[PDB]
Amino acid sequence: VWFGFXX
Amino acid sequence: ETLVRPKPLLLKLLKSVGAQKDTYTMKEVLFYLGQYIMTKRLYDEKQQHIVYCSNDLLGDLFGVPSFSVKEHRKIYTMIYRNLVV
Numbered sequence: 001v002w003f004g005f006x007x
Numbered sequence: 008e009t010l011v012r013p014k015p016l017l018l019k020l021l022k023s024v025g026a027q028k029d030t031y032t033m034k035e036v037l038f039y040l041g042q043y044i045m046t047k048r049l050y051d052e053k054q055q056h057i058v059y060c061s062n063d064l065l066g067d068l069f070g071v072p073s074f075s076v077k078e079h080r081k082i083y084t085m086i087y088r089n090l091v092v
Contacts, residue, residue, distance in 0.1 A: 001076040003050060005041020006034050 008033035009092065017089040020064055036086065040065075 001007075012030050013021060024042040026035070044050055049059050058065075061072035069085040076082070 001056065003041035003045045003055070005044070006037035 008035070011036060011090040011092055014089050014091070016064065017068055020068070036090070040086075 009032065010030055011033060013036065018029065020043055021031070021036070021039045024039050024046055026039045028035075031039075043065065044058055047063060047065075049063060049065065050057060051059075056076050057073060058076065059073050060066035060069060066072055068089050070088075071085070074081065074085075
């Protein structure tokens with residue numbers, strides 16, 4: 001969920 | 008992931024962070040949205056779950072001034088309004 005994003 | 012065609016203002020946003028296509032996987036869309044949030048500094052590093060998108064095209068597209076990355080369903084709903092499958 002870190003923007004630099006998505007599991 | 009599944010193939011989606013962003014509507015024009017979402018395509019513009021994606022291209023603004025270096026996306027090159029008209030058709031994307033959902034994983035690509037999420038990636039580029041994250042790059043945009045970072046490059047426009049729409050977050051604070053000490054509460055990284057919160058996106059602040061008021062007064063930004065992203066907030067216009069999503070229909071909200073702020074959201075948490077934990078709102079999985081709501082984020083997909085907001086993205087899907089800006090795409091066609």
